[PDB]
Symmetry: C2
Subunit: 113 residues, 2 copies
């Protein structure tokens, strides 16, 4: 089954369950992870897992950090991890902004429509 928290992250941020799972996979990782480690674990293409990580990183839910300027292919190399305080701060802030934007919109529906 899925927790209440999983269902909430999915709604707030428009993420599929796996993307949500990915956050918790990284939160309970001892080491930082690159694209190719994640693509092999999750059994998917680098393009797919890159899209998800990118969406998680833009939203500030995971950390994306450069560990090399040139990698075997001459491109920068990034690792992905979860910062526990940052993660908790981001969600809390997002949740307060969602509640306020909702109540405001509700007010307009229920009283001014």
């Amino acid at each position: 089954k899925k927790t209440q928290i999983e269902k909430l992250l999915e709604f707030m941020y428009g993420l599929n369950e796996k993307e949500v799972q990915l956050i918790f996979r990284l939160l309970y990782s001892d080491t930082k992870l690159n694209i190719e480690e994640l693509a092999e674990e999750f059994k998917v293409s680098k393009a797919l897992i890159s899209k998800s990580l990118s969406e998680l990183a833009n939203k500030g839910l995971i950390e994306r950090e450069k560990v090399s300027n040139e990698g075997r292919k001459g491109r920068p190399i990034y690792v992905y991890y979860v910062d526990r305080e940052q993660l908790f701060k981001r969600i809390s802030r997002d949740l307060e902004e969602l509640v306020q934007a909702s109540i405001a919109k509700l007010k307009e529906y229920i009283f001014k429509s």
Copy 2:
């Protein structure tokens, strides 16, 4: 497509698309409404709309009012409506509680 608010009510109260429309049909009415006109409007049987109205009233999302005990076979007759202040206060409070409960839960998961 679906309104974000409609999306929120579906998520919060486990309601389908038609239940939210039912709530808004009541909200936007100038009068209380009986099951016969609502069954007709929502194109379902009286039993079905009656079951839905009863479950929405037990969620507190709408109000019910018994107006007669003299339906066929002594079955009660009800009217349904939405108390606009109470609905605002309910959803507002439920939203605030959902967020605090969520933040507490993942505070213990991220840290404890």
